[PDB]
Design a protein around this nucleic acid. Structure first.
Lengths: 140, 103, 59
RNA sequence: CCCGGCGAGGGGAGUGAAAAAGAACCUGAAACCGUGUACGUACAAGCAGUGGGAGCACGCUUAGGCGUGUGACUGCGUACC
RNA sequence: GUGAAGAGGGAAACAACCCAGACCGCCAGCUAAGGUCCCAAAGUCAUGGUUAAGUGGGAAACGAUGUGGGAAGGCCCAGAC
RNA sequence: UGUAACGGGGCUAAACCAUGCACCGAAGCUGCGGCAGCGACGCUUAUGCGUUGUUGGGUAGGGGAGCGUUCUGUAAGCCUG
RNA sequence: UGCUGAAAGCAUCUAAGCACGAAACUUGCCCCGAGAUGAGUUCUCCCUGACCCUUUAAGGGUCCUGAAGGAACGUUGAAGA
């Protein structure tokens, strides 16, 4: 006689091979979060505690299309405000999947709540039909 | 049978529930008035052509049976936040449901 | 959570919940789609024809 | 009667209605504490929450939505005068 | 314009300053300005242009063979670039 | 003294403007209970029950009302080993 | 710093395209590193006898010539908080 969905831990993870890589990426990197919460799997718990697993394929082809990609710095300065500084731009950093240009969830669950334990579930390898480091039961 | 009733109880759409309604302005603790207010209750929600909607009225009615909402249930907050200090104040209201769905 | 079962499969077939509602709410008999349409997450194999009703006018 | 340090305290006995009346004598809670039934749990923010509830030590029901609290998820918010 | 002995939804988080606006409840409806792909909870809508610069939350005294829309005009195939 | 002007992240149109249009949607007026004041009604009348109108944030002031650790009494009166 | 060569038969590294480039940003340079629990692994090496309780994938619980082994084992020390 309740309508909500506790726990659910986790019912729907949708093992989809992200052919979107590069080609239209900036239209669905913006929506990886509203995917791992929704737009198909919105049928269950569209705000709380759940898990998710797309099947990653490549990293350095972020596409992103504009003057951004060649002067937009990424910073971290992880220690005592770093002092000496870091400035390699979005196509020159994207040459490694790392912590800020590859995950998209860093931009989209931004304080850490909802995100606080399921960090690597998408594998965070990259490498196509040379290296499928993901699921053995049939992907999509 | 399916309540076509809405007024402050529209979750009650189900055959049973048992789901709450209002306790109205007047005599509301006499059990029953034995007449039935409605006849357009459902059609599709019980036959071999399903729709979530009221396209017919299949010869079943809903009885007037307000029940016994007597023992004063849990309702009543107070007031503070700045010097807005009250600890009585809260004139009573509540919810109830229909007796037993005999249909 | 409720209205997901009125977009999650329909968007594919093009029947997007708010632009399909400027279609629905042309009919003065259908207004209360807001919750009660929740029957779509298990009535699927017979809910799947409720789009055909008026498709040659409503679409 | 028994035990230790020819000691303290106890464990039964017993004058006693009573030793939660025992000679650090008031039929008796307040600042703080020792061991346990269960927790949340050695990636911590934000008056330590009431929610909204998943199942847990446990106690009911020929099933019947609960009688229990640390409070995974996180929502709200800054209680003063 | 009711300000604190008014508490917080306005306009940026300038508790006063636009002004009528909260007693008290709901697993019940939704009004305005903000928006409305988003952390965020509804159309990748239909019908019409402009822009092809990252423009958009930095202007003033000027400049300038980058182009855009409009209406009057100047030279022109007895030959105007 | 960590890039720190939408909160983020900069979205080549999702956009900017113009024409359409459906959901979101404080407390905001609605479902529907409950009802302290000041009035108006059906009538009652020691006076009140409901209808109907204005409308219900309340430290400076006047109005107007609730209960107690027990003292001074209701009271060899009813209550208790 | 110029290459072909145009915008605008001119002139010309730039406008499409080319190529090098310095405390600089990048880099298996120096120096600790998932204590970065996102918690991945290589290599070399090591343990396989019999059973019990039922609220069962949850377990919880036994009983194997005792195996090679380990901190205490007697001085200390090179670090000795």
């Amino acid at each position: 006689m309740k309508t909500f969905t506790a726990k659910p831990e986790t019912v729907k993870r949708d093992w989809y091979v992200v052919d979107a890589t590069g080609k239209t990426l900036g239209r669905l990197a913006t929506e990886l979060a509203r995917r791992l919460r929704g737009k198909h799997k919105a049928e269950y718990t569209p705000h709380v505690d759940t898990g998710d697993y797309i099947i990653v394929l490549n990293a350095d082809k972020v596409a992103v299309t504009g003057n951004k990609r060649t002067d937009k710095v990424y910073y971290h300065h992880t220690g005592h405000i770093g002092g000496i500084k870091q400035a390699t731009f979005e196509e020159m950093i994207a040459r490694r999947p790392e912590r800020v240009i590859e995950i998209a969830v860093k931009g989209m669950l931004p304080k850490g709540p909802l995100g606080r334990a399921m960090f690597r579930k998408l594998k965070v390898y990259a490498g196509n039909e040379h290296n499928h480091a993901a699921q053995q039961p049939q992907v999509l | 049978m399916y309540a076509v009733f809405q007024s402050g109880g529209k979750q009650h759409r189900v055959s049973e529930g048992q789901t709450v309604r209002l306790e109205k302005l007047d005599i509301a603790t006499g059990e029953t008035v034995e007449f039935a207010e409605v006849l357009m209750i459902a059609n599709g929600e019980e036959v071999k052509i399903g729709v979530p909607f009221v396209d017919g009225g299949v010869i079943k009615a809903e009885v007037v049976a307000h029940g016994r909402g007597e023992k004063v249930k849990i309702v009543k907050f107070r007031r503070r936040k700045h010097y807005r200090k009250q600890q009585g104040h809260r004139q009573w209201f509540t919810d109830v449901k229909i007796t037993g769905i005999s249909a | 959570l409720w209205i997901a079962r009125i977009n999650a499969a329909a968007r594919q077939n093009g029947i997007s919940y708010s632009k399909f509602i400027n279609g629905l709410k042309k009919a003065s008999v259908e207004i209360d789609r807001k919750i009660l349409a929740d029957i779509a997450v298990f009535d699927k194999v017979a809910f799947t024809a409720l789009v055909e009703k008026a498709k040659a006018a409503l679409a």
